[PDB]
Design a protein around this nucleic acid. Structure first.
Ligand SMILES: [Zn+2]
Lengths: 36, 109, 81, 73, 95, 98, 94, 106, 81, 99
DNA sequence: AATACACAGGATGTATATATCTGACACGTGCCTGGAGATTAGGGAGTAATCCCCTTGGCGGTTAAAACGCGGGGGACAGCGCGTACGTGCGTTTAAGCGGTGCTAGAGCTGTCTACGACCAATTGAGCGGCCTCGGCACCGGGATTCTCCAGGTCC
DNA sequence: GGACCTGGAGAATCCCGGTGCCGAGGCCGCTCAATTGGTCGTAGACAGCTCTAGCACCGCTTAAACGCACGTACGCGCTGTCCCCCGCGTTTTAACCGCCAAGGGGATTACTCCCTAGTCTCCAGGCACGTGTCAGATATATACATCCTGTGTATT
């Protein structure tokens, strides 16, 4: 599995809890991460 | 037939009947409707689920299984709306976020 | 119980300032911090003892302090309520 | 070939490239326009991090492509 | 020996439903209990005031909805309103 | 020959990081408890305190002091300085509305 | 459509303290709002005190403690004295 | 042959009206006897204090009536009343005359 | 109804500054004040209009505005209630 | 010959005394009404307003702005200046808690 | 020979007195809804009595933290020079404000009538308190990597 | 010669294993609070009507907003000095952990009875209209009060 990021658009590993590129924290199922 | 608790009927986990009793005996109005405890239970369940999910993801990063106050503190202060809702709350044994002003830092390229 | 406000020692105030993010501290900050802490404690303990006396008790409980802080605009999570 | 670089800042940088061109030249063009060295440049497209040793055609990049730039220091 | 109710088991059930393999410490559970109590009391007081303003004697789902729309920030309020509407609609259409 | 000596301003940043990562109590418990008992004496004679009461008081007081120091640091940096002085504390307490 | 307010009582108190002084309509509205605010604050604090103490009755002791918790310094002392005097006068007359 | 409770308590503020407001205001299941009397006495004292100060302010200003400016002056110049009313704004009240020392040419 | 924020002219902002006690004013204060005023009005009007919507009314009254202000710690005297 | 010319500072102090002595609305009423209608237009269409509501909005807004400018002046004086700049407003609003 | 400083005079601005005239406050009148008086009755709260949990006072030892002293470097604060960005004033330009008239949308009340919430009694399962373990987390120990800092080489 | 550059030493923090204690977690028994079923009154929805007041438009004064010019004072950058605070060291000091002992007071139970809710009757206090005088606003004219520029001349 994986989880896409709403900021960097880069797919992140399923067992990862932040983007390894844009450092944006993993978002909740309902509310997505902000611009920054 | 068999009794069916209202919480199971509404598809919730929080106690609909207990919230109904608290509304009834809490000096809020003369009467309390039927759907008011259901709506209130849904709202509280959602607001607790969001915090618990973020705190779980925060705890797994720290290579820990047990949730502590620090994870809750970090999750609340890093979120914007959650911080806005809880702006006048102090969490015991939560600490503070890491933050140092740029002018105090040493010379950087 | 004669003079214990001095028990909040200089290293403790320095540590609290460090957690606050302060790099350099002047030598006149300690008296100011002591006065501010004394005023805050006076207010909260006055409210707590008011609640304690109304309930006809002789022991200040955790709920008294939580309620005293709640009325003052600074709610506290992690002790009940 | 026209490509837009949607940097996380919010600027849609536009550059001209060639379908068989290498990623290194595309990176160098940004340094020509902005000044960000190719070493510090990170390009994101369809969840794939491009490499200077490959080419645009190797990543199935078509016309009117949109790219993202991330600074990693 | 005397009963003292709380929200512990429901918090734990929601946690297990979201994170199957994660526990909680005692102080964290107490903090979550206080959080749920605070939210309940805030919304109930707002609904009471808003019902009294219009010279009404009962508080219903509409008053709770308006209180939620008043007390929460944007996205949180929208999602909570959606959740409450879905829960009430499911509750009504079942006997 | 010269023993190692850090330049001024480096141990301070280390302390800042160390205390900004921990979540313990920065004041000794016994003197703070004695201060609490002294202040409460002026209102009622022969009072008694639960341990949770003293702990809650200490946690709240430390949170308040940390917030005040944060605002004081902002005020000091505003005036093109690095050192905090009582003027900054007074300005912070005036703007906050105390 | 009989609306009601505290206007006549505030006017009577004013004439009691200053015999030859008037008051404008907007000052009247401000004093009305002040009276309503004081009433609601003290009532809410007394209700909270009753709920905390596991009681379902609001008495004069609840109001006294609410006034002490809400008014600062000399205002609280004088208000407590006034309330005690009023209650002890009301009781002695059947 | 009926005597109002306000007259018996020695008060100018109503007592039965306040008793009704407490009863219908959702504050408890019961309302005691002396609670409305105590509440009315406290409210009357506060109103009397404010009105006395405002009337003194207007008379010294060579007026007969009381305007919101006098209320604002009296409220903001008293420390206890300022603390009690720290969150309230008065319409058409203005502000106290205050100017910083360093802004004056000397 | 467009760009009506510009109706708050520079002399008006200068007048409001003078009542606060200010002597010298920079040439970039006016935009900041306009932004602050716009955000404040957005908040209060949002609360007032949702109060009106709950009452099933199509007119914003003074009571709705006062209630909106009251729930933000900005109590107002002199318009009833 | 040369017309009478006050030095920079006297007219500002004169205006400070004048507007600190009076209690009238300082923003023209109709432009503020139009701004109020503009802002509310994005929450409900074909809304209507009572005049007293507009007056209450204006009173509260002016009180808030005067208080904010007072805090800005205090912060400017702290930084050893006489002028007010946007960073002073930002510091005051940061310390207050509005951001 | 130079330069500051108090004084004198012009000049705007504000404070004071006087006439008038208009609308808002203070008072009277009538009536209708809401507070007062009497009577009933059920439960809330006072109060005596008992048990035991938790708070307070005491003593000993171990050791980390607080207290005192010294040397120096980075920062706070004063002083000076420049230049540009606001403040003051004058001559046009725009639009708020006052008064008036006309339209009708929508608040505010009144009259019916039914669905909905309170209240009571019985009964069954959800939820709480006491127990008893194990596995997560804390602590110790050791080495490995990261980050400062000054002493010399060399090039500009 | 001085500044840029580097190398080596040293202290601090991080990663990796290993051991041990107690707090989270699941179970068991009970018991009381949620649930089901039925009855009854009224709050609230819905329709109909009246009439205030919110909106739109026009027309004319006229103070306020606007644009431009000129100069001065204040914001900002730079430089120099000195003393205060930081970092490190050595010697005190009192916090902290551990046990033991005693009793004040929170917590609960049972009993009695006074106080408040609810009801009906009666009538007067408080509110809505209507009316009229005078406090305050507005206009006009002197008169006092700070602000500014220029100069005599005494000091240096
Ligand atoms: Zn990302």
């Amino acid at each position: 599995g994986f989880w896409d990021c709403s900021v960097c658009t880069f797919r992140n590993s399923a067992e990862a809890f932040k983007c390894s590129i844009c450092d944006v924290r993993k978002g909740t199922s309902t509310r997505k991460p902000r611009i920054n | 037939g068999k009794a069916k608790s209202r919480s199971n009927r509404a598809g919730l986990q929080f106690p609909v009947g207990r919230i109904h009793r608290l509304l009834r005996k809490g000096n809020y109005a003369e009467r309390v409707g039927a759907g008011a405890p259901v709506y209130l239970a849904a709202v509280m369940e959602y607001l607790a689920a969001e915090v618990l999910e973020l705190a779980g993801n925060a705890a797994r990063d720290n290579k820990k299984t047990r949730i502590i106050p620090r994870h809750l503190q970090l999750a609340i202060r890093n979120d914007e709306e959650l911080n806005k809702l809880l702006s006048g709350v102090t969490i015991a044994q939560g600490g503070v976020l890491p933050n140092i002003q740029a002018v105090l830092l040493p010379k950087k390229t | 119980l004669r003079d214990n406000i001095q028990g909040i020692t200089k290293p403790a105030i320095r540590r609290l300032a460090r957690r606050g993010g302060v790099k350099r501290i002047s030598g006149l900050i300690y008296e100011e911090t002591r006065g501010v802490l004394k005023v805050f404690l006076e207010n909260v303990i006055r409210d707590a003892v008011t609640y304690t006396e109304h309930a006809k008790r002789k022991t200040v409980t955790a709920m008294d302090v939580v309620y005293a802080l709640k009325r003052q605009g600074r709610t506290l999570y992690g002790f009940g309520g | 070939m026209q490509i837009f670089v949607k940097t996380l800042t919010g600027k849609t940088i536009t550059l001209e490239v060639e379908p068989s061109d290498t990623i290194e030249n595309v990176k160098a063009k940004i340094q020509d326009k902005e000044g960000i060295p190719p070493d510090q440049q990170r390009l994101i497209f369809a969840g794939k991090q491009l490499e200077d040793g490959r080419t645009l055609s190797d990543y199935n990049i078509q016309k009117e492509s949109t790219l993202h730039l991330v600074l990693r220091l | 020996r005397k009963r003292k109710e709380s929200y512990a088991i429901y918090i734990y059930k929601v946690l297990k439903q979201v994170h199957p393999d994660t526990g909680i410490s005692s102080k964290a559970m107490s903090i979550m209990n206080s959080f749920v109590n605070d939210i309940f009391e805030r919304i109930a007081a707002e609904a009471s005031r808003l019902a009294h303003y219009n010279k009404r004697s009962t508080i219903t789902s509409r008053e709770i909805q308006t209180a939620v729309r008043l007390l929460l920030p944007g996205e949180l309020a929208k999602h909570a309103v959606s959740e409450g509407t879905k829960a009430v609609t499911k509750y009504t259409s079942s006997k | 020959k010269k023993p190692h000596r850090y330049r001024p301003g480096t141990v301070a940043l280390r302390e800042i990081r160390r205390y900004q990562k921990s979540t313990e109590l920065l004041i000794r418990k016994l003197p703070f408890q004695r201060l609490v008992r002294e202040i409460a004496q002026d209102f009622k004679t022969d009072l008694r305190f639960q341990s949770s009461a003293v702990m809650a008081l200490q946690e709240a007081s430390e949170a308040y002091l940390v917030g005040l120091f944060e605002d004081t640091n902002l005020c000091a940096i505003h005036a093109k300085r690095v050192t905090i002085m009582p003027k900054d504390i007074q300005l912070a307490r005036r703007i906050r509305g105390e």
